[PDB]
Amino acid sequence: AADSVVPAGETVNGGTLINHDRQFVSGTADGMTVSTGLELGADSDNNTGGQQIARGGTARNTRVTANGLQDVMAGGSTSDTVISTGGGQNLRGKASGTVLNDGDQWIHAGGRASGTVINQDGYQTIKHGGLVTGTIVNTGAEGGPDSENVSTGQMVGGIAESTTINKNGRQVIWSSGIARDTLIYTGGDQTVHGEAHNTRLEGGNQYVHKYGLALNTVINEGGWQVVKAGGTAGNTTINQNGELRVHAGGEASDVTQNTGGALVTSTAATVTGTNRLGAFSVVEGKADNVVLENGGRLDVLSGHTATRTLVDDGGTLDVRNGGTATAVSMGNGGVLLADSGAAVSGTRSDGTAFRIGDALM
């Protein structure tokens, strides 16, 4: 019902916005508490009230609470907005230091959010043409790898740059989205339907879904890059105690498999790269020179072949009915599983020969 304007060059300190009141900020508004403008929710066209930052205006230390809407127009700016309990920031200008404590931030085309902190139950949605940098993601993956929650955390339909994903943090990259230069700690995860470039798994997980593309993922201790059917990973580095898992119909090309790195796949996947014994490939049902250790595993399916597989400590070679593995080299701690109809031959730890055609060593 009531309406106020902060002209350019003027500054207003404090205040509360309730019952659909509106503050039109062309100057500076510091410490406003915004508790109206979003009563009907984000999917309604009939909301009224809230704080509007026009071109050249600025807001500082704003609190957005339940039903509160801070609307930042192109050319407007905010610093250190704290969003709690079902408030939201609609961003078409610039925001710095926004904290989401179960609040929403929507970044529209041309909007830019730097340093947003997504705390528990917070929700950052980046639309096509929107950009965020330096985001800290602390929520959305509380439920672990089995949780398909996408209602909290960071949803990327535009571009996210320099994101840190901490324990419990979840980033989802939709088909049109791009994440560049992401750091993912243990307990954090990133799901790729769009594109990811330069991702560091410092214990965290990256799931590459159908049509997703992950470029230059570095997998350090505890990290996990999973490539589903129809997903693609290019130029992955598997470091010690990291794992690359490529499902049937998934693709990983130009893999750098360093010593102690685990590769987990089957002969129905497509994998190429180099390991500590040179070039290796799993292509069109034929594996050559795969190195399995420290959790690595290769399933050789019916009609498929593997040659020159090194099964070293913590590696597992699993040859199904109708699969063939020749020149298998068994190291100490390596395991071979051969089902009934499997044909397997090689040499073991001892330099001694063996031939099959259930568990070995």
Author numbering: 0 to 356, 361 to 364
Extract from the study:
The best-characterised SAAT, antigen 43 (Ag43), is a protein that contributes to cell aggregation and biofilm formation in commensal Escherichia coli K-12 as well as in major pathotypes including enterohemorrhagic E. coli (EHEC) and uropathogenic E. coli (UPEC). Ag43 possesses a modular domain organisation that is common throughout the ATs, which encompasses an N-terminal signal sequence that directs the secretion of the protein across the inner membrane, a passenger (α) domain that is responsible for the function of the protein, and a C-terminal translocator (β) domain that facilitates the translocation of the functional α-domain to the cell surface. After translocation, the Ag43 α-domain (α43) is cleaved but remains attached to the cell via non-covalent interactions. Similar to α43a 13, the α-domain of all three Ag43 variants folds into an L-shaped right-handed three-stranded β-helix, with each turn of the β-spine comprising three β-strands linked by loop regions.
